[PDB]
Amino acid sequence: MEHVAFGSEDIENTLAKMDDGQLDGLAFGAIQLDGDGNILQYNAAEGDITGRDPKQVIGKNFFKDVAPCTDSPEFYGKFKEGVASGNLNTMFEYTFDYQMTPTKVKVHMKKALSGDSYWVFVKRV
Numbered sequence: 001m002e003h004v005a006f007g008s009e010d011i012e013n014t015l016a017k018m019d020d021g022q023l024d025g026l027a028f029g030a031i032q033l034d035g036d037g038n039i040l041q042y043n044a045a046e047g048d049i050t051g052r053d054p055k056q057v058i059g060k061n062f063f064k065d066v067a068p069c070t071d072s073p074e075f076y077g078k079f080k081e082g083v084a085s086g087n088l089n090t091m092f093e094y095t096f097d098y099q100m101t102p103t104k105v106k107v108h109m110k111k112a113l114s115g116d117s118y119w120v121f122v123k124r125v
């Protein structure tokens with residue numbers, strides 16, 4: 001696979017500029033968002049967790065379109081606050097339940113190293 005653990009302290013360095021192929025080798029779901037929440041990258045593990053087809057969701061807005069169950073203070077609010085501050089590093093459990101069997105996950109959102117983009121990492125719990 002790719003040898004990176006969920007929640008690693010330097011994950012943003014390890015995944016910096018990772019192409020879509022390499023991202024598909026992670027053991028956990030990985031989504032890269034711009035500051036508005038548009039999907040830039042979406043890996044295979046995430047698609048397995050959620051059922052979404054990665055290439056279909058890239059370019060969509062995660063909060064508006066793909067994941068309305070995350071359009072809440074508890075998820076989007078945290079994301080939006082992090083984007084506004086230009087800093088984000090949070091881990092929390094959540095349940096994904098839009099047009100899918102409800103699935104509890106652990107989420108790690110972390111600002112990407114460079115630029116202004118934001119990772120959403122997901123694993124099952």
Ligand SMILES: *C(=O)/C=C/c1ccc(O)cc1
Nearest residue numbers: 050067068069070096098
């Ligand atoms: C709630 O609507 C959650 C949906 C969802 C979460 C994560 C994804 O990668 C895709 C859909």
